[PDB]
Specification:
heme binding, Globin-like_sf, about 150 residues, about 0% strand, monomer, mainly alpha
Length: about 150
């Protein structure tokens, strides 16, 4: 788990995201889709986006960014006591959306990148360590629910 000081760094960093949740969410998803184009094929409603300009110009992609980060932010604020929130999220992603756990590693990397890009010099080594722990905890709990389902991809 994370210590109290680590959770405090995670939620301090999350305050940066909440100042502009749709814009963080857009950029994180665009980083995901452009770095890993197989991820976009999972999204019937984003599969039409052929260029990064089209991605940036999609209001619906910003709206999804809002939904995705709002879910993540509520989970983070549980400081690891997140079973009731996380289990349905994992089950939805395995059974309906068919999202391999590797995509959660991809978006975790994208969050760290986007945080440095939007907050350069204001996301220090301690804060990156804490946020990395929180994202590992989230994906590892999701991975345990996928194992229950026997879900691979």
């Amino acid at each position: 788990g994370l210590s109290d000081g680590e959770w405090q760094q995670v939620l301090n960093v999350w305050g940066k995201v909440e100042a502009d949740i749709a814009g963080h969410g857009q950029e994180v998803l665009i980083r995901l889709f452009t770095g890993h184009p197989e991820t976009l094929e999972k999204f019937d409603k984003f599969k039409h986006l052929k260029t990064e300009a089209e991605m940036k110009a999609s209001e619906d992609l910003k709206k999804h960014g809002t939904v995705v980060l709002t879910a993540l932010g509520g989970i983070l604020k549980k400081k690891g006591h997140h079973e009731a929130e996380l289990k349905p999220l994992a089950q939805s992603h395995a059974t309906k959306h068919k999202i391999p756990i590797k995509y959660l590693e991809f978006i975790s990397d994208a969050i760290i990148h986007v945080l440095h890009s939007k907050h350069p010099g204001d996301f220090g080594a301690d804060a990156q360590g804490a946020m990395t722990k929180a994202l590992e905890l989230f994906r590892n709990d999701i991975a345990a629910k996928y194992k229950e389902l026997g879900f691979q991809g």
